[PDB]
Design a protein around this nucleic acid. Structure first.
Ligand SMILES: [Mg+2]
Ligand SMILES: [Mg+2]
Ligand SMILES: [Mg+2]
Ligand SMILES: [Mg+2]
Ligand SMILES: [Mg+2]
Ligand SMILES: [Mg+2]
Ligand SMILES: [Mg+2]
Ligand SMILES: [Mg+2]
Ligand SMILES: [Mg+2]
Ligand SMILES: [Mg+2]
Ligand SMILES: [Mg+2]
Ligand SMILES: [Mg+2]
Ligand SMILES: [Mg+2]
Ligand SMILES: [Mg+2]
Ligand SMILES: [Mg+2]
Ligand SMILES: [Mg+2]
Ligand SMILES: [Mg+2]
Ligand SMILES: [Mg+2]
Ligand SMILES: [Mg+2]
Ligand SMILES: [Mg+2]
Ligand SMILES: [Mg+2]
Ligand SMILES: [Mg+2]
Ligand SMILES: [Mg+2]
Ligand SMILES: [Mg+2]
Ligand SMILES: [Mg+2]
Ligand SMILES: [Zn+2]
Lengths: 105, 58, 50, 122, 203, 86, 118
RNA sequence: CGCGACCUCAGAUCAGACGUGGCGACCCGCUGAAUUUAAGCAUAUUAGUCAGCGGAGGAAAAGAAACUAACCAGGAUUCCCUCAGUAACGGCGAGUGAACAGGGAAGAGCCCAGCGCCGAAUCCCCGCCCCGCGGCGGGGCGCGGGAAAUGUGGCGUACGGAA
């Protein structure tokens, strides 16, 4: 029953919501585990860059973000064949490659 | 492939291949390419030429 | 009944064997809390199921 | 005196059997004495005789089974008793050689493009 | 290659030649029982393109599925409930008849593993499929590095869990904006991810 | 004669002990167990009785093989070898 | 050959006999029901004494898996005596009593004296 | 008439293997209500939820676009924040309800069929010899036996490939 001036609300609590309540008490443990696995991988790959392969320059898709660059998936095959590196050697020497990327300019 | 490349001087075809569709196309192909073709009684006797149990065509 | 099966006779034999009071020499153990056998069974009172 | 197990490995099956039979006869006499009403000494020796029976039998079984394992060691087919009894899944899993053998194509790929060791200057 | 010619033959199912073949084969499979082993695949090209090979350890089972829809097994058509749930006749089964076929084939052949299946005929009251099964403990399969993936225990009873192609077809999974109610592992996974109250420690 | 008088005519039983689960729930005329369904290959178990589920499960019995399995897993299922003799 | 019956019966084929490439089990099992393990102890009650004195019988308690033939052979082996007949019953406790009557030329009193019950 | 092939189909306590059933907190595939809310109730809601059935693993499922976008374009799958209680659905009532882009955790890609070319160049099994042997494997020898031309192995797969 509404009473006086208020804002009428629509709580999505009509299902069996108490059966699915995902708590976050293991969040610090998860952070510790992630950091420990990160250190283990970094020490395993001894001299290689700890952050994996290099990645290319990428423009964000939509008009809202198309003024910003970021890191993409991998370098494109046109870029590889213009740089002179081989498709199957780039990954061995540590360069991210994807055959999906086009080059419109 | 030999028939469609014209390297076969004649073709022998079995008559009782238990899916007939493995060779049902073959006579028309052989006629169109020009090579002679024959139907021989018995894929078993045809496969006796090779050392195998059965052969459809040679 | 007098007409029994081997299985039922064996079961009755086991129940009769376990219907027994405790020996007194266990009452003098160190960490002993048992005072009597609380799983007794009188034929008239408890009918054992079956 | 005190029947142990170290002094029984070097013996032979026939005297092992005769010692076992003598021990069984002694145990039977002890049980008769128990039922008729005897001495606490014999009542206590009953368990000693039983354990002596147990160790004689286990020595016999161990010698027999080790001999049989030596017999079947070189053969390809051997009894399920002599096969290794790991878990069922570990018996069904791919064995070491055939889960490591690999195709010629991808082994050629590995030999043509090995993963290099590299570093990047800061 | 003759396989391409066979491919176009089986694409021209409507011609008189294929009509004769389907009529005869359907009659023969109808005379036969509902679950039997075919010595050879009836469509070698189709089985090969589905993943079959002429080796030892591959078997083909030809099985028959009664045709039609699924009616609700309710006593005397009395669904005690609301009118929305009263229908028992025009209902349909979520899975496909090919998937049902593979399921019962694998169920009978417990020690074998189902790869795929194809269509070989149909009449008014029955459909016929040939299921391609693999014996996982044959050494000719165990020692092949490109097909020993089927020996792993994780692939046990694929057709029961809907991992074969026919089972995947009825799961509504795939890339794109059409399959939005499956993003995640499956439909249940998407539902569970969406219907859960994430309560952070600090909210 | 609805109660006391009719209670006196009960002299032959409808259930006996079954071979599988040992409970007095083996129906004689049906030849089926009321608790586990003995003739059926699969154990009779339902999700609407948690108490019945926990009364007889893996945690309730002797664990004859599976406890030894746990003990052997702790060391990795070793076989064929013996500790270094003195 | 011509057919004289309008039925078709499955022809009888050659059924070859098992030859195992390896025995299923490593060794034959040991007979755990031997003479010593088949007889446990002789009864020493007043009824047993009356029986041994009067009917020339010997009263033993054996295990439930023994039959009269095995009991007779076990008594013959252990005590070197001849056995006429054996009566058996299973007691309400679970043990299986045995009444063993001896041949007329043996003396049950002497057998009891040597075995150790009196 | 007899004999010999192949094809389909039988019987074996034939030689060697494999499946069954249990637990089921998490996972996959089917089946699937009604209490309740709507201040009545039938669509709707509860809810693809409980109950029921089947199938696994140490994780499962998914997964390398028949994608998103309409930008100066991004680029497998899975998870977290936000998008957003939004677009939309709804006796447009009660109620229900995503995804794209953005930031992150992780980051790995590949293989067939088909078209072709290589004297089937391919695989399984039995016997001897040598070694290894508690994951049954390596090598030599058999005018040894089978599978396979109704198609095995090598190169090769949309990023093009072959000569
Ligand atoms: Mg108020
Ligand atoms: Mg009473
Ligand atoms: Mg290849
Ligand atoms: Mg409905
Ligand atoms: Mg449904
Ligand atoms: Mg998969
Ligand atoms: Mg479709
Ligand atoms: Mg009745
Ligand atoms: Mg069950
Ligand atoms: Mg056999
Ligand atoms: Mg199961
Ligand atoms: Mg209401
Ligand atoms: Mg109300
Ligand atoms: Mg009402
Ligand atoms: Mg409704
Ligand atoms: Mg709904
Ligand atoms: Mg449920
Ligand atoms: Mg497990
Ligand atoms: Mg997986
Ligand atoms: Mg692709
Ligand atoms: Mg907002
Ligand atoms: Mg909903
Ligand atoms: Mg996104
Ligand atoms: Mg990272
Ligand atoms: Mg090929
Ligand atoms: Zn039962």
């Amino acid at each position: 029953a509404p009473s006086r001036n208020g804002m009428i609300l629509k709580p999505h609590f009509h299902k069996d919501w108490q059966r699915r309540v995902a708590t976050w008490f293991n969040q610090p443990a998860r952070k510790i585990r992630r950091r420990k696995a990160r250190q283990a991988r970094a020490r395993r790959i001894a001299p290689r860059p700890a952050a994996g392969p290099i990645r290319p320059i990428v423009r964000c898709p939509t008009v809202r973000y198309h003024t910003k660059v970021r890191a993409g998936r991998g370098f494109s095959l046109e870029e590889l064949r213009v740089a002179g590196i081989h498709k199957k050697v780039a990954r061995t020497i540590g360069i991210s490659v994807d055959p999906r990327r086009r080059n419109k300019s | 492939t030999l028939v469609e490349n014209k390297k076969a001087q004649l073709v022998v075809i079995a008559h009782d291949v238990d899916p007939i569709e493995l060779v049902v196309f073959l006579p028309a192909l052989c006629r169109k390419m020009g090579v002679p073709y024959c139907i021989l009684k018995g894929k078993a006797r045809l496969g006796r030429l090779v050392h195998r149990k059965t052969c459809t065509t040679v | 009944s007098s007409h029994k099966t081997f299985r039922i006779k064996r079961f009755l034999a086991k129940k009769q064997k376990q219907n027994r009071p405790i020996p007194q020499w266990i009452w003098m153990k160190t960490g002993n809390k048992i005072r009597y056998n609380s799983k007794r069974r009188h034929w008239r009172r408890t009918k054992l199921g079956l | 005196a005190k029947i142990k197990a170290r002094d029984l490995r070097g013996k032979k099956k026939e005297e092992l059997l005769k010692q076992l039979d003598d021990l069984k006869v002694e145990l039977s006499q002890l049980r008769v004495a128990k039922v008729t009403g005897g001495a606490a000494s014999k009542l206590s020796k009953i368990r000693v005789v039983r354990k002596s029976i147990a160790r004689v039998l286990t020595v016999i079984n161990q010698t027999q089974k080790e001999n049989l394992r030596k017999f079947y060691k070189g053969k390809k087919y051997k009894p399920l008793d002599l096969r290794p009894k790991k878990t069922r899944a570990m018996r069904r899993r791919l064995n070491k050689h055939e889960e490591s053998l690999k195709t010629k194509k991808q082994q050629r790929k590995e030999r043509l493009y090995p993963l290099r060791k590299y570093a990047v200057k800061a | 290659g003759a396989y391409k010619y066979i491919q176009e033959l089986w694409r021209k199912k409507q011609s008189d030649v294929m009509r004769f073949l389907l009529r005869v084969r359907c009659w023969q499979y109808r005379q036969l029982s509902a679950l039997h082993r075919a010595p050879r695949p009836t469509r070698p090209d189709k089985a090969r393109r589905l993943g079959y090979k002429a080796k030892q350890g591959y078997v083909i089972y030809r099985i028959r599925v009664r045709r039609g829809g699924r009616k609700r097994p309710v006593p005397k058509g009395a669904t005690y409930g609301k009118p929305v749930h009263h229908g028992v006749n025009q209902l349909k089964f979520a899975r496909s008849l090919q998937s049902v076929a593979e399921e019962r084939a694998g169920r009978h052949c417990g020690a074998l593993r189902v790869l795929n299946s194809y269509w070989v005929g149909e009449d008014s009251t029955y459909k016929f499929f040939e299921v391609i099964l693999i014996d996982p403990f044959h050494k000719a399969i165990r020692r092949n590095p490109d097909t020993q993936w089927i020996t792993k225990p994780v692939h046990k009873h694929r057709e029961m869990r809907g991992l074969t192609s026919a089972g995947r077809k009825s799961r509504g999974l795939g890339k794109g904006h059409k399959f939005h109610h499956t993003i995640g592992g499956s439909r249940r996974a998407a539902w569970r991810r969406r219907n859960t109250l994430q309560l952070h420690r600090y909210r | 004669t609805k109660g006391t008088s009719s209670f006196g005519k009960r002299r032959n039983k409808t259930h006996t002990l079954c071979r599988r689960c040992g409970s007095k729930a083996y129906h004689l005329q049906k030849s089926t167990c009321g608790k586990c369904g003995y003739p059926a290959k699969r154990k009779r178990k339902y999700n609407w009785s948690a108490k019945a589920k926990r009364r007889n499960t893996t945690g309730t019995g002797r664990m004859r093989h599976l406890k030894i399995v746990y003990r052997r897993f702790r060391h990795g299922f070793r076989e064929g070898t013996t500790p270094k003799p003195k | 050959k011509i057919r004289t019956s309008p039925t078709f019966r499955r022809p009888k084929t050659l059924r070859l006999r098992r030859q195992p490439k390896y025995p299923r089990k490593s060794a034959p099992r040991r007979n755990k029901l031997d003479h010593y393990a088949i007889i446990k102890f002789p009864l020493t009650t007043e009824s047993a004494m009356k029986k041994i004195e009067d009917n020339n019988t010997l009263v033993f308690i054996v295990d439930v898996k023994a039959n009269k033939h095995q009991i007779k052979q076990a008594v013959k082996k252990l005590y070197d005596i001849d056995v006429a007949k054996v009566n058996t019953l299973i007691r309400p406790d679970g043990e299986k009593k045995a009444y063993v009557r001896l041949a007329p030329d043996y003396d049950a009193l002497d057998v009891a004296n040597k075995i150790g019950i009196i």
